[PDB]
Enzyme design. Structure first.
Site, PDB file in Angstrom:
ATOM      1  N   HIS A  64       0.835  -1.195   0.000  1.00  0.00           N
ATOM      2  CA  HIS A  64       0.000   0.000   0.000  1.00  0.00           C
ATOM      3  C   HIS A  64       0.868   1.242   0.000  1.00  0.00           C
ATOM      4  CE1 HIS A  64      -3.325  -2.370   2.344  1.00  0.00           C
ATOM      5  NE2 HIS A  64      -3.327  -2.636   1.048  1.00  0.00           N
ATOM      6  N   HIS A  91      -3.094   1.323  -4.407  1.00  0.00           N
ATOM      7  CA  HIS A  91      -2.468  -0.002  -4.428  1.00  0.00           C
ATOM      8  C   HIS A  91      -2.835  -0.677  -5.726  1.00  0.00           C
ATOM      9  CE1 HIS A  91      -6.466  -1.045  -2.503  1.00  0.00           C
ATOM     10  NE2 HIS A  91      -6.408  -1.897  -3.515  1.00  0.00           N
ATOM     11  N   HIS A 116      -5.828   0.724  -8.043  1.00  0.00           N
ATOM     12  CA  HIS A 116      -6.932   1.282  -7.218  1.00  0.00           C
ATOM     13  C   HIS A 116      -6.473   2.521  -6.489  1.00  0.00           C
ATOM     14  CE1 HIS A 116      -9.077  -2.846  -7.095  1.00  0.00           C
ATOM     15  NE2 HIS A 116      -9.241  -2.186  -8.231  1.00  0.00           N
TER      16      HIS A 116
HETATM   17  N1  LIG Z   1      -9.358  -3.407  -3.242  1.00  0.00           N
HETATM   18  S1  LIG Z   1     -10.446  -2.272  -3.054  1.00  0.00           S
HETATM   19  O1  LIG Z   1     -11.706  -2.700  -3.559  1.00  0.00           O
HETATM   20  O2  LIG Z   1      -9.921  -1.005  -3.420  1.00  0.00           O
HETATM   21  O3  LIG Z   1     -10.779  -2.217  -1.483  1.00  0.00           O
HETATM   22  C1  LIG Z   1      -9.775  -1.732  -0.601  1.00  0.00           C
HETATM   23  C2  LIG Z   1      -9.613  -0.365  -0.416  1.00  0.00           C
HETATM   24  C3  LIG Z   1      -8.668   0.093   0.492  1.00  0.00           C
HETATM   25  C4  LIG Z   1      -7.879  -0.811   1.211  1.00  0.00           C
HETATM   26  N2  LIG Z   1      -6.933  -0.264   2.129  1.00  0.00           N
HETATM   27  C5  LIG Z   1      -6.382  -0.762   3.302  1.00  0.00           C
HETATM   28  O4  LIG Z   1      -5.280  -0.426   3.722  1.00  0.00           O
HETATM   29  N3  LIG Z   1      -7.128  -1.703   3.958  1.00  0.00           N
HETATM   30  C6  LIG Z   1      -8.471  -1.634   4.385  1.00  0.00           C
HETATM   31  C7  LIG Z   1      -8.917  -2.701   5.151  1.00  0.00           C
HETATM   32  C8  LIG Z   1     -10.193  -2.685   5.680  1.00  0.00           C
HETATM   33  C9  LIG Z   1     -11.029  -1.616   5.427  1.00  0.00           C
HETATM   34 CL1  LIG Z   1     -12.565  -1.618   6.211  1.00  0.00          CL
HETATM   35  C10 LIG Z   1     -10.620  -0.551   4.621  1.00  0.00           C
HETATM   36  C11 LIG Z   1     -11.542   0.579   4.268  1.00  0.00           C
HETATM   37  F1  LIG Z   1     -11.141   1.249   3.183  1.00  0.00           F
HETATM   38  F2  LIG Z   1     -12.787   0.172   4.005  1.00  0.00           F
HETATM   39  F3  LIG Z   1     -11.664   1.473   5.258  1.00  0.00           F
HETATM   40  C12 LIG Z   1      -9.325  -0.565   4.112  1.00  0.00           C
HETATM   41  C13 LIG Z   1      -8.055  -2.179   1.015  1.00  0.00           C
HETATM   42  C14 LIG Z   1      -9.008  -2.639   0.115  1.00  0.00           C
HETATM   43 ZN   LIG Z   2      -7.843  -2.923  -4.460  1.00  0.00          ZN
END
Ligand SMILES: NS(=O)(=O)Oc1ccc(NC(=O)Nc2ccc(Cl)c(C(F)(F)F)c2)cc1
Ligand SMILES: [Zn+2]
Length: 257
Positions: A64, A91, A116
């Site tokens: 990240h 990320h 993303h």
């Molecule tokens: N992959 S995706 O589709 O973009 O989704 C994500 C978006 C942001 C993250 N970032 C993190 O560091 N972890 C992370 C882990 C849990 C939660 Cl609840 C969140 C939040 F963003 F919801 F608050 C972020 C992880 C997954």
């Molecule tokens: Zn993602």
């Protein structure tokens, strides 16, 4: 303890996270014959301050790049939004080979990786933690990465990986504006969906760029050479971290173009 291997991976997530089988899950296959053009969609507006770049961290399944998010120095506006959304992170996701690494697909076509750029609704909520479980809490820009020419804009990011090789390593990562990674057209698709890994909250308004960006086969190898193990343990390369596409369950994907 979830991951991407056969025992703890996307097919096993529903056991501790039943929302995995929900109605607003991501990613999806965008079928272009079924999108609805929406004239009410404004253009996407990004304005990011490179001074908000903070840190790069190996989180075991991915890495990240985090941003200071105490104020509105770096914001996303426009598109389907009435509110300003505050940048907090970008990320990537990638696959075990060039043939399949993106999360979203377009007319069944799998790309090699996906960027993303994640934001939270600071107009309505006080923190990321508060916003994370709210239906209108998060906005993620997804950019499909097509294997081809090396992408020079990726190189500060890739150059940083040598300092965070194993799980839990973190390093300062500063003076970087991630709008430089976005394609030149910001024509987009939008749909209501979810985080693509646990806890899989259905809190994301997705902005999927129509135009891809490039990545070389060797740049993809740099992602896959990150290690999921802690220092001193047997090396376990981070070979993939992309979720399969999920059923639309009646949602409408809108096009800005
Ligand atoms: N992959 S995706 O589709 O973009 O989704 C994500 C978006 C942001 C993250 N970032 C993190 O560091 N972890 C992370 C882990 C849990 C939660 Cl609840 C969140 C939040 F963003 F919801 F608050 C972020 C992880 C997954
Ligand atoms: Zn993602």
């Amino acid at each position: 303890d979830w991951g991407y291997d056969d025992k703890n991976g996307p097919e096993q997530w529903s056991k501790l996270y039943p929302i995995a089988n929900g109605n607003n899950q991501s990613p999806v296959d965008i079928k272009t014959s079924e999108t609805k053009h929406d004239t009410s969609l404004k253009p996407i507006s990004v304005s990011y301050n490179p001074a908000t770049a903070k840190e790069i961290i190996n989180v075991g399944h991915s890495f990240h790049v985090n941003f200071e998010d105490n104020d509105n120095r770096s914001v996303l506006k426009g598109g389907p939004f009435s509110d300003s959304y505050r940048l907090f992170q970008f990320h990537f996701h990638w696959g075990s080979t060039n043939e399949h690494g993106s999360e979203h697909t377009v007319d069944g076509v799998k790309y090699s990786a996906e960027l993303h750029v994640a934001h939270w609704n600071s107009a309505k909520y006080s923190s990321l933690a508060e916003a994370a479980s709210k239906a209108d809490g998060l906005a993620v820009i997804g950019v499909l990465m097509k294997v081809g020419e090396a992408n020079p804009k990726l190189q500060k990011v890739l150059d940083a990986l040598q300092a965070i090789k194993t799980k839990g390593k973190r390093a300062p990562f500063t003076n970087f504006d991630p709008s430089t990674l976005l394609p030149s057209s910001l024509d987009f698709w939008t749909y209501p969906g979810s985080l693509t890994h646990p806890p899989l909250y259905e809190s994301v308004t997705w902005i999927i760029c129509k135009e891809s960006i490039s990545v070389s086969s060797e740049q993809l190898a740099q992602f896959r050479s990150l290690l999921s193990n802690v220092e001193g343990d047997n090396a376990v390369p981070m070979q993939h971290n992309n979720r399969p596409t999920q059923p639309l369950k009646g949602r409408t994907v809108r096009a800005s173009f």
